[PDB]
Design a protein around this ligand. Structure first.
Ligand SMILES: *[C@@H]1O[C@H](CO)[C@@H](O)[C@H](O)[C@H]1NC(C)=O
Length: 399
């Protein structure tokens, strides 16, 4: 009878957007899928094509001045690090100033929107284009953070994303001998949803991410894989991790902070006070975006908020009007926000899940005799429905 989310061009192109292995093509928790040579040494470089919503690097600095514990503060100056002693004060922000003595980052969006050289149609893409178009003279492309609330575009001099261990870096000052404070990738239930992280390469095709990335939570559907002639949401799969959550927010954080998330990160040196970029290592992994990136919040039959998490690139959806499907790349929110909608170039449709009952009639599958359930695909108040129901009484003789 067919997988309905595949028996259509419109469906296909739409299910493709959640496929992070396809367009994003790189680590999400850590993103370092490319190499680039600078001053004769080979460094890792972020390369993912998709923007990562809510992602910030949490620092672990001492809780005393001069330490701000915010990665959007400037990379420190030599003088500032002379004054502070170990570990480094400051944040990850590029702090270069042009010859004119004008400042690179953070850079105002109002300036970008009125620049012809900036050919992107959306504010997020403009920042991205700017990241991509601006790097004593190198070919390295810094990753960037768009502060979408302050409309400032940040270029990040530091590409490192994760450092831990008493062998590498200090935590809150301890041990006190270490040059670097530790830091990791974070997503928070409450903090910083308005920051967007990305490799420069989001900017090469500054409009592409609009339809090739899973930017938003998908409200009212669970990620699923087509099997045994029906859509199996992750709960029905053996490889899936399921964790009890208190709010749909924790689930979303989990799709990004779980152990299996696409990660391009066992370092082999104490970074110098000045090494803003990971070194290329012989055995470095490139995830390509393969990972436990996918997940949804649902409530089970007993009233519990749960969180299914899978590494299976989904190819069908199970309707569940309470559910929200998250990935590592996109936002908690499910509303297209103003900064990825052209300022004007008409918007690109996703009508892939709109329907009428007349042109979209109840279609039933054959009986999965192992689960004694069958696919039913319908249209209810203008939206596609996809669930696994009871077989007929007849078919039941076979389970
Ligand atoms: C996702 O994309 C990759 C590479 O483009 C592909 O090999 C894989 O089959 C895709 N997974 C799907 C469509 O479920």
């Amino acid at each position: 009878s067919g997988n309905p989310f595949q028996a259509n061009v419109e469906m296909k192109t739409f299910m493709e957007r959640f496929n992070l292995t396809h367009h994003h093509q790189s680590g999400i928790y850590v993103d370092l899928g490319q190499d680039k040579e600078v001053d004769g040494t080979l460094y890792r470089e972020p390369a993912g094509l998709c923007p990562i919503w809510g992602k910030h690097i949490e620092l672990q600095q001492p809780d005393r001045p001069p330490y701000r514990n915010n990665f959007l503060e400037d990379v420190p100056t030599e003088k500032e690090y002379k004054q502070s002693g170990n570990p480094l004060p400051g944040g990850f922000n590029l702090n270069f100033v042009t010859p004119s003595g004008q400042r690179i980052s953070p850079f105002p969006m109002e300036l970008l929107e009125k620049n012809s050289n900036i050919k992107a149609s959306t504010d997020l893409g403009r920042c991205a284009e700017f990241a991509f178009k601006t790097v004593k003279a190198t070919k390295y492309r810094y990753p960037f953070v768009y502060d979408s609330k302050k409309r400032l575009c940040h270029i990040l001099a530091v590409s490192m994303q994760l450092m831990e261990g008493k062998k590498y870096c200090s935590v809150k000052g301890e041990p006190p001998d270490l040059t670097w404070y530790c830091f990791k990738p974070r997503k928070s239930v409450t903090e910083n949803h308005h920051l967007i992280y990305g490799s420069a390469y989001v900017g090469e095709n500054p409009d592409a991410f609009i339809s090739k990335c899973p930017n938003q939570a998908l409200r009212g559907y669970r990620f699923g894989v087509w099997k045994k002639g029906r859509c199996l949401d992750y709960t029905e799969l053996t490889d899936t991790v399921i964790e009890r959550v208190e709010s749909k927010a924790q689930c979303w954080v989990k799709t990004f902070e779980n152990d299996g998330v696409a990660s391009d990160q066992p370092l082999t040196s104490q970074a110098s006070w000045n090494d803003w970029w990971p070194l290329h290592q012989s055995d470095q992994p490139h995830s390509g975006g393969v990972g436990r990136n996918y997940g949804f919040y649902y409530v089970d039959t007993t009233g519990e908020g749960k969180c299914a998490l899978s590494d299976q690139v989904p190819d069908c959806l199970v309707s569940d009007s309470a559910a929200v499907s998250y990935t590592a790349a996109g936002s908690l929110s499910e509303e297209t926000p103003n900064f990825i909608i052209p300022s004007n170039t008409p918007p690109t449709p996703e009508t892939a899940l709109q329907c009428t009952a007349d042109k979209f009639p109840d279609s039933f599958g054959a009986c999965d005799v192992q689960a004694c359930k069958r696919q039913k695909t319908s249209c209810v108040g203008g939206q596609i429905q996809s669930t696994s129901v009871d077989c007929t009484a007849d078919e039941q003789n076979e389970c």
